[PDB]
Design a protein around this nucleic acid. Structure first.
Ligand SMILES: [Zn+2]
Ligand SMILES: [Zn+2]
Lengths: 248, 76, 112, 48, 24, 91
RNA sequence: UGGGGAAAGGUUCCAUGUGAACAGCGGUUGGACAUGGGUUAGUCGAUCCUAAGCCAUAGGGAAGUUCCGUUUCAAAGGGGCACUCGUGCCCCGUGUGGCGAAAGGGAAGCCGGUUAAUAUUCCGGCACCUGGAUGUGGGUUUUGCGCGGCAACGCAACUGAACGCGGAGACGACGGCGGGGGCCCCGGGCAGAGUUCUCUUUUCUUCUUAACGGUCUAUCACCCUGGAAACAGUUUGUCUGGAGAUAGGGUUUAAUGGCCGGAAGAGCCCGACACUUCUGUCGGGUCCGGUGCGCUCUCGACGUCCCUUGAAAAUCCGCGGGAGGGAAUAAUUCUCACGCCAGGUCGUACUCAUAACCGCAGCAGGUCCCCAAGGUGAACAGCCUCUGGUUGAUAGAACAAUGUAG
RNA sequence: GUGAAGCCAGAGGAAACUCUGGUGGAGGCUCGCAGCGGUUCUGACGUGCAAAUCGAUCGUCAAAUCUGAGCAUGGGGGCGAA
């Protein structure tokens, strides 16, 4: 046989990501003395839309503490922000929607977004349209904080990690049906070449492990082990269970 | 092409170090007299409707340059 | 009712091959190739077109005298005129509120 | 076409002084609604 | 304001000054 | 002169896509094309521009909101609790 | 089946002559044969900038031809001035290389004539852009770097280094509405032509105005006075208004609008004289209105759709800031007017297709665009005609079977 | 051709509310020219005009439509609404 479809996607010839219309990536500022001991301020100049994503972005302008110049950054916008607002960042900044605080200067129960997994990586944890993370408890000795993730899992991150207050805008984007093949095509045609997906049961035995036959059927089991050979993992990988879930 | 509203500045143009040529066209149908002069960069035109200021002016301009009334039907 | 033709080698209608039908002193219909249209500069912080400034291509602005490319006040170009008034008012008030707060804090601290 | 004709006539009357702004406004909205069919009908309503 | 104009005007000024200095 | 009795804005879809999907998309479509009163200037001149962006036609301010509504119930609850939480914690 | 082009073709373009061969018949004809001639650019392109993408440099793999790597664990640059003179001095720095578009971005030329064959290039006239040195007129100053308007702002000028901020280049698809150029249509007038047994104050043709400048206007928008409910203004389409409407008065972005220069001396239409040619010449004319869900291009204010929001760089301008420099017999770094010099290299003929390209060929196949008249008619439907182009596909005679098409 | 939201006016009712006439121009809607495709005649030709063409009849036609140039993927490899 030949190489099956999900092996060709690793070469990166046709299945790359379209990035002509993306202007910059979304990150925080780098750690610096000012934000680590006090606070700094910036202006919200514009609120823009970048293709291939929910969660509109916000352009913020800060001054420079060491040179005569002005720097501009791009954040993800929380529900409530508006052009012309004043945003603050640092250890001693008040906690209102929009602000940027080290996660240790925060009481339990507040929701944040765009949290740093390690201080300085510039935001990694919750940054999609309408999601957030919750703090649960602290540990002043050997500083470390426990958080809950939008999937249910719990984690422990260092106390000097950062997070910017609020809930990511974009709301309930996935509520109305797409309702039209064209809308699905337009949705995907700005991320990747993956939309029209053919059904391995309709394939030929030279093309896919599910292959041919005089009737369309899988043949063997559909659950594939976790330590299998590259080119075999096509189906429900390492499935612990099947069927409709009941409790949760 | 450039206009000259009055007469005084027209002789000032003609009395210049590079005014190489001039000519005079008379239109019988519309009863008009046009004074054209050719400088380096531009071509300056003076329009008149009278009949006696035409000839007297012609003696006032410098004598060194030449004047040829344009002839109807000019061959290559 | 005569029909016309292009006069350059580009046969395509590609937003930089602009034409105009004309009639000539010889009694014929010809085409002139015209350039693109100018555009008027906008304000620095509001976004509206400034009045009193022409609309040209970005290179023709180098042959025109200065008093034709600006207006006679502070922030002549790039600012409309209503937005500049806000700048004076805003600047003055912030300075006034600054000194009063500073004197209030120091005098209060002196009291202790 | 019909809408322009009616509106053109109405401004003439208001400027001349044959009517005032209250009657003008009432008739303008009465005209946007399909009430008057042509120029003759409009003047009759004004006269009454 | 192109660099050319700034450089051209200064060069023109210097050339005129040099001529005056030599005559003196 | 009602031209319909129940279909409404979802009448452009004709007889396609199935009754329940048409009726279910109406809930978001009706509120997305609506017009809301501004909060900064007071005029009723706010309309949607992008998937999460709203702007006032008169004051030119721009605000980040929900997907199909200027605000969402989840966000409003959070702001009230957080404001209440901060005040007691600092008092 | 007209008039011109991109890819491709490569002398097939024009003139003179011609035995055989080729043009599935002939041939005095030819895209065939023989001998000569023909392609002129500061303004049209390439040259300049980057896009998807390709390749050097610092490094690390591999026995090796070489694979990765493009800002990465690199000591990576560029700006100013003076001597006697090359040598010497003084400042700013994370650096940040090349290639890649004849449809993307982009400084600048129009009309008339001319050759057997080229012309936005040649000839005549009238212009424009960039670069470089310089003078006259005017402007400013003894209060050292201009005045006027309440204001939006105006004018022939009217200092501005380092550093920094902003604008233009710079952008989707569709729907109706309004302004402008071109074409189409109707009436009158002057010239020429067609028809006329009968009728027709008849039917047809010409009546044109370039680039580049001056001056006067033209939707949106903005400024001043004043303060609105018996609510008003208003679009084909309900938006606007104490965050200041109606009304009155003003400033400004935008001519493919009117008048003048260019420009009548041009071009075109008639009439009258000359004569082997070389040649020509002298009279007239080249106006005034109307209309429109008309066709085409362009501009402007609106509206709709998106889990879709619809490129980057070179180049140029404006502002904040105040370094340096500067007169009282002149001084002057005035983006004002006029005046001086120069603008290198390659392509430019012709076809673009029922014969110049690809299909073994002079093959009913295939191959990307621009302009688009009259009538019937809802119409780029079908049918007939004008400008323009063809009359080229082996022929003559008779009308049986069987055929193909109607 | 049909005529979705939004807007104007009028009429009926004690009220809650309901009717009627216009305006407007949405839709992977519809008839139908050019382009694109290739259902039937199992038509023509079948040492053809042609190593896939010709004629009539047909499918779609404002969007998952048609198309030029520049660039990328190279053989047990690519690409594939299969
Ligand atoms: Zn402004
Ligand atoms: Zn508002």
């Amino acid at each position: 046989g030949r190489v099956i479809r999900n092996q060709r996607k690793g070469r990166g010839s046709v299945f790359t990501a379209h990035t002509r219309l993306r202007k910059a990536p979304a990150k925080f500022r780098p750690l610096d003395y000012a934000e680590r001991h006090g606070y700094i301020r910036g202006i919200v100049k514009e609120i823009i839309h970048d293709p291939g994503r929910g969660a509109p972005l916000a352009r913020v302008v800060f001054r420079s503490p060491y040179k005569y110049k002005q720097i501009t950054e791009t954040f993800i916008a929380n529900e409530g922000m508006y052009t012309g607002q004043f945003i603050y960042a640092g250890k001693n900044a008040a906690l209102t929607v929009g602000n940027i605080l080290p996660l240790s200067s925060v009481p339990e129960g507040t929701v944040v977004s765009n949290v740093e997994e390690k201080p300085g990586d510039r935001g990694a944890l919750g940054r999609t349209s309408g999601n957030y993370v919750t703090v649960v408890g602290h540990n002043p000795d050997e500083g470390k904080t426990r958080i809950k993730l939008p999937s249910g899992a719990k984690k422990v991150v260092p106390s000097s990690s950062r997070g910017m207050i609020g809930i990511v805008a974009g709301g309930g984007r996935t509520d109305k049906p797409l309702l039209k093949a064209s809308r699905a095509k337009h949705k995907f045609a700005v991320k990747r070449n993956r939309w029209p997906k053919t059904r391995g049961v309709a394939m030929n035995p030279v093309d896919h492990p599910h292959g041919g036959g005089n009737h369309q059927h899988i043949g063997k089991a559909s659950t594939i082990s976790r330590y299998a050979a590259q080119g075999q993992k096509a189906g429900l990988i390492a499935a612990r269970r099947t069927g409709l879930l009941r409790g949760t | 092409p450039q206009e000259v509203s009055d007469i005084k500045k027209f002789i000032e143009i003609c009395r210049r170090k590079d005014a190489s040529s001039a000519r005079i066209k008379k239109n019988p149908k519309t009863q008009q007299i046009k004074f054209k002069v050719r400088c380096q960069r531009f071509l300056y035109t003076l329009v008149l409707k009278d009949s006696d200021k035409a000839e007297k002016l012609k003696q006032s301009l410098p004598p060194n340059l030449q004047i040829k009334d344009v002839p109807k039907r000019n061959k290559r | 009712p005569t029909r016309v033709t292009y006069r350059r080698r580009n046969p395509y209608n590609t937003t930089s091959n602009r034409t105009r039908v004309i009639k000539t002193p010889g009694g014929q219909l010809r085409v002139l190739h015209i350039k693109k249209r100018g555009t008027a500069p906008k304000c620095g912080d509001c976004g509206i077109k400034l009045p009193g400034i022409p609309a040209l291509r970005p290179r023709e602005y180098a042959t025109i005298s200065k008093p034709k490319k600006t207006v006679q006040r502070a922030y002549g170009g790039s600012r409309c005129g209503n937005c500049v008034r806000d700048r004076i008012i805003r600047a003055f008030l912030i300075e006034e509120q600054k000194i009063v707060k500073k004197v209030l804090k120091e005098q209060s601290q002196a009291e202790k | 076409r019909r809408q322009r004709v009616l509106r053109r006539l109405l401004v003439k009357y208001r400027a001349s002084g044959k009517i005032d702004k209250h009657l003008y406004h009432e008739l303008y909205h009465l005209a946007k609604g399909n009430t008057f069919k042509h120029k003759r009908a409009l003047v009759e309503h004004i006269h009454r | 304001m192109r660099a050319k104009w700034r450089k051209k005007r200064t060069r023109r000024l210097k050339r005129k000054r040099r001529k005056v200095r030599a005559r003196s | 002169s009602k031209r319909t009795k129940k279909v409404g804005i979802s009448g452009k879809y004709g007889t396609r896509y199935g009754a329940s999907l048409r009726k279910l998309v109406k809930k978001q479509e009706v509120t997305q094309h609506a017009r809301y009163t501004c909060t900064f200037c007071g005029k009723n001149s706010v309309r949607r521009t992008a998937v999460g962006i709203w702007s006032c036609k008169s004051c030119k301010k721009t605000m980040a909101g929900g997907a199909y509504t200027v605000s969402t119930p989840a966000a409003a609850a959070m702001r009230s609790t957080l404001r209440r939480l901060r005040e007691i914690t600092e008092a």
